Amino acid sequence: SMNPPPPETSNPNKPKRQTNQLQYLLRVVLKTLWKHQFAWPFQQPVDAVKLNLPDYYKIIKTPMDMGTIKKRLENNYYWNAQECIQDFNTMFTNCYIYNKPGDDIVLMAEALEKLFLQKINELP
Numbered sequence: 078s079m080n081p082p083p084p085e086t087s088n089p090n091k092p093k094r095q096t097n098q099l100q101y102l103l104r105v106v107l108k109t110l111w112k113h114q115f116a117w118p119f120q121q122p123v124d125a126v127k128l129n130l131p132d133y134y135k136i137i138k139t140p141m142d143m144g145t146i147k148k149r150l151e152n153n154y155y156w157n158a159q160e161c162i163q164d165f166n167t168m169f170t171n172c173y174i175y176n177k178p179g180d181d182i183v184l185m186a187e188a189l190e191k192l193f194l195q196k197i198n199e200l201p
């Protein structure tokens with residue numbers, strides 16, 4: 078079908094804090110995943126029109142990507158680190174839901190998820 082609008086990334090009416098955890102999530106976790114060889118499918122929303130996948134947004138009702146997560150962190154959209162961790166987990170899980178066990182794109186998300194969990198292990 079049409080793509081939906083991307084997820085909201087900025088709400089100037091949401092109260093804002095800096096934490097060590099939110100700082101680590103942007104400066105370490107997002108940055109490390111971004112630069113990974115396997116990041117590029119996850120750096121922007123799924124453009125299902127360009128990809129010719131009419132069923133993508135029939136299956137995926139909670140879309141998420143690292144581009145949105147980067148903007149959410151930069152815009153202090155998250156109050157609790159867990160909100161950001163949940164967006165990363167939504168992104169990975171969306172990939173496992175839409176795709177099939179052993180698919181190249183699933184193995185890519187699995188490796189990103191493993192790196193995620195290694196970085197989250199050291200959340201301050």
Ligand SMILES: CCOc1cc(C2CCN(C)CC2)ccc1Nc1ncc2c(n1)N(Cc1cc(C)cs1)[C@H](CC)C(=O)N2C
Nearest residue numbers: 117118119121123124127128130133171172175176181182
């Ligand atoms: C046909 C071209 O497709 C893409 C182009 C770009 C460009 C990368 C560089 N930037 C600057 C522009 C977009 C980024 C991503 C894609 N494709 C893409 N994005 C997300 C997903 C995706 N495909 N695919 C398809 C596949 C990918 C691979 C490696 C195997 S199968 C699946 C299904 C939607 C997926 O889950 N994701 C997140």
